[PDB]
């Protein structure tokens, strides 16, 4: 109706005194570990304090977070663990979960976080090691760490790629295909391809994700200020910049609340808190009020009915969308997420809009279709961790059954993407038409299910680039960026390149690679006509170190 009130039956809130925390977190996990396409959603929230005897195992659609003004305010003598036991060592489907704002003192000196995509690890203090591979040496496809600090060494082991920003680590064990770092103290030296480390001193701009906390015995949302030249944690010394907003200024969205009503809230001047669950909407969610926070908990999910655009953000400063999944419905939406309206040359440099831990799925948990997933019109927008994913397995998958032509389409100027994961689109996964774009870390996989060469011919080109820049663009820069193929339906296919871009002095790429998995199809080149083809069946990347 208003601000505040309860968080709903999916927001489980603990203090040190709570009867059997362990057996409880294991209760949620037993429900959620193999629950890949289920509709249950959980947020586990912990008041400031010290928690003994806890191995908090995190399954699908589970978020865990501390409630302290600082991470060290909520301390586990114990672990927040992701492993792969349900896929027999294979961490490759460990999606859609999250940990934030906790200190961990892990049980054997290491904490195990063996995740793949859409599994953010933010604002975490690990007083030990961090192993990013499940128990195994099994295959893994992560991942994202921000504003964290790992007193010890990070161990990616069998992880294919990884992005870390604005953190400190006590060590970094290895790189496989693409480990990228920006603003990370203790990050290994720039060395791609050998090892494949892409290392930037600082992050051009970042703004830490808002989060729910107890300002004493009062719930508020902390809303971090941005930094230029971010390096290291925002909190280390942490009395940093930002505003604390009472929960009583948030529409606490649940039940099967509606779209008229959610949009009524923003207009009446409220922020949005999506408690964990699944929201239809037969109409779009609309945020055209400057500095509106729309914060999800427990992988809160929006499904658009009727072919509408789930979320539309108008031409305003400061909007902070965080921690939402948008799951396409049966009717093809032209767009799923629009950031800014169309032809809008207004600049937003002081107080840009951001999408953080915004995930998109097309198919998998049933039929879904969308023409474009995310369109970014707003100049100066920050895209800080997104996974935009056309499903390659689960219910409702198929070259027409869940066709999604376009992943992300950036038309705004001065847009920054940090931790960009986009996979399986029928045409261009990513297209960049705006000026002066920057991407730090890209991971792509091409659609597995294109039937034949003729189905993916792109004028004079075989296949659509995983990342296209329009030939008129004069400035662009990308760092640490890979495209992989697995043409299973037709391993005779050729993909002409991962990347396409005009040859111009202001259009620069660093540390590119393409990869064929098991000789299933091949790349002709890396970028335009530069870089070798892939060949053999051995899964050996082909890399370009700088371009043009």
Distance CA 422, CA 405 (A): 12
Strand arrangement, sheet containing 242-246: 211-214, 219-224, 242-246
Q: State the resolution, in angstroms.
A: 1.8
Distance CA 58, CA 412 (A): 37
Question: What tokens does 388 get?
Answer: 């935009």
Extended strands (E) in 82-160: 97-100, 103-104, 110-112, 121-122, 125-126, 129-131, 144-146, 149-155
**Torsion sign across C-alpha atoms 476, 482, 487, 488:** negative
Do residues 10 and 43 lie in contact, with contact meaning Cβ atoms separated by under 8 Å?
A: yes
Do residues 163 and 199 lie in contact, with contact meaning Cβ atoms separated by under 8 Å?
A: no
Distance CA 153, CA 174 (A): 10
Distance CA 290, CA 315 (A): 9
Beta bridge partners of 443: 421, 482
| CB contact set of 135 (below 8 Å; sequence gap of 6+) | 83, 84, 85, 89, 112, 114
Distance from the Cα of residue 505 to its chain's centroid: 31
What backbone torsions phi and psi does residue 41 show, to the nearest 5 degrees?
Answer: -145, 130
For the chain, report the end-to-end CA distance as a whole number of angstroms. 56
Question: What tokens does 518 get?
Answer: 């098991």
Distance CA 98, CA 211 (A): 12
Q: Is 98 exposed, middle or buried (0-12, 13-18, 19+ CB in 10 A)?
A: buried
Do residues 220 and 250 lie in contact, with contact meaning Cβ atoms separated by under 8 Å?
A: no
Distance CA 263, CA 84 (A): 40
Distance CA 495, CA 125 (A): 42
Residue with tokens 């391993």: 491
| CB contact set of 20 (below 8 Å; sequence gap of 6+) | none
What does each C-alpha distance from 320 to 64, 207, 267, 383, 544 come to in angstroms?
A: 20, 9, 16, 10, 35
Rounded (to 5) percent helix, strand, coil in the chain: 5, 45, 50
Q: Give, as one character, the DSSP assignment of residue 337.
A: E
| CB contact set of 421 (below 8 Å; sequence gap of 6+) | 117, 118, 386, 387, 388, 389, 442, 443, 444
Do residues 481 and 441 lie in contact, with contact meaning Cβ atoms separated by under 8 Å?
A: yes
The C-alpha R_g of the chain, in whole angstroms, comes to: 22
Q: Is 462 exposed, middle or buried (0-12, 13-18, 19+ CB in 10 A)?
A: middle
Do residues 257 and 234 lie in contact, with contact meaning Cβ atoms separated by under 8 Å?
A: no
Residue with tokens 């371009």: 547
What does each C-alpha distance from 508 to 171, 316, 384, 472 come to in angstroms?
A: 30, 30, 21, 14
Do residues 210 and 222 lie in contact, with contact meaning Cβ atoms separated by under 8 Å?
A: yes
Q: Mapping DSSP to helix (H, G, I), strand (E, B) and coil, where does residue 27 land?
A: helix
Distance CA 518, CA 397 (A): 22
């Amino acid at each position: 109706v208003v601000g505040g009130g309860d968080l709903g039956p999916n927001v489980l809130v603990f203090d040190p005194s709570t009867p059997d925390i362990q057996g409880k977190v294991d209760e949620v996990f037993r429900k959620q570990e193999s629950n890949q396409f289920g509709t249950d959603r959980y947020a586990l929230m912990f008041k400031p304090g010290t928690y003994n005897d806890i191995n908090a195992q995190i399954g699908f659609y589970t978020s865990i977070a501390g409630l302290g003004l600082n991470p060290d305010d909520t301390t586990f003598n114990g672990d927040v663990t992701v492993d792969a036991g349900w896929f027999d060592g294979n961490a490759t489907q460990n999606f859609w979960r999250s940990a934030e704002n906790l200190a961990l003192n892990p049980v054997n000196g290491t904490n195990r976080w063996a995740v793949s995509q859409a599994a953010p690890f933010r604002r975490m203090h690990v007083k030990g090691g961090l192993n990013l591979a499940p128990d195994g040496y099994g295959w893994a496809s992560g991942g994202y760490i921000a504003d964290s600090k790992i007193d010890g060494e990070v161990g990616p082991y069998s992880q294919q790629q990884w992005y870390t920003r604005d953190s400190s680590v006590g060590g970094w064990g290895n790189g496989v295909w693409n480990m990228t770092f920006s603003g990370v103290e203790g990050a290994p030296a720039q060395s791609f391809p050998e090892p494949p480390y892409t290392t930037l001193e600082t992050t051009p701009v970042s703004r830490e994700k808002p989060f729910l906390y107890l300002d004493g015995d009062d719930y508020k949302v902390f809303v971090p200020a941005k930094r230029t030249n971010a390096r290291g944690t925002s909190w280390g010394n942490g009395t940093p910049e930002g505003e604390s907003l009472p929960l009583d200024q948030f529409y606490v969205v649940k039940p099967g609340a509606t779209a008229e009503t959610i949009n009524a809230a923003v207009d009446q001047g409220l922020h949005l808190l999506f408690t964990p669950g699944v929201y239809h909407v037969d109409q779009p969610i609309e945020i055209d009020r400057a500095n509106t926070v729309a914060l999800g908990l427990g992988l809160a999910t929006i499904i658009p009915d009727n072919g509408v655009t789930a979320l539309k953000v108008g031409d305003v400063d400061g909007v902070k969308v965080a921690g939402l999944l948008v799951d396409a419905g049966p009717v093809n939406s032209e767009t799923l997420v629009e950031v800014g309206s169309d032809g809008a040359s207004g600049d937003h440099a002081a107080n840009p809009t951001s999408l953080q831990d915004v995930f998109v799925r097309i198919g998998g948990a049933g039929p879904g279709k969308a023409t474009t997933s995310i369109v970014v019109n707003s100049n100066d927008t920050i895209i800080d961790h997104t996974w935009v994913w056309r499903a390659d397995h689960g219910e409702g998958v198929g070259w027409e059954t869940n066709r999604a032509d376009y992943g992300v389409h950036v038309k705004g100027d001065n847009v920054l993407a940090t931790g960009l994961f986009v996979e399986h689109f029928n045409k261009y996964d990513v297209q960049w038409s705006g000026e002066n774009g920057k991407t730090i870390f890209y991971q792509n996989a091409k659609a597995y299910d294109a039937p034949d060469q003729a189905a993916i011919q792109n004028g004079d080109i075989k296949g659509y680039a995983a990342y296209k820049v329009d030939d008129s663009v004069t400035t662009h820069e990308g760092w640490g960026m890979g495209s992989y193929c697995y043409f299973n339906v037709n391993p005779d296919i050729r993909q002409q390149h991962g990347f396409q871009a005009p040859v111009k002095p202001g259009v620069k790429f660093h540390d590119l690679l393409v990869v064929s998995l098991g000789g299933k199809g091949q790349y002709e080149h890396v970028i335009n006509d530069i870089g070798d083809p892939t060949s053999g069946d051995t899964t050996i990347p082909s890399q370009v170190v700088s371009f043009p």
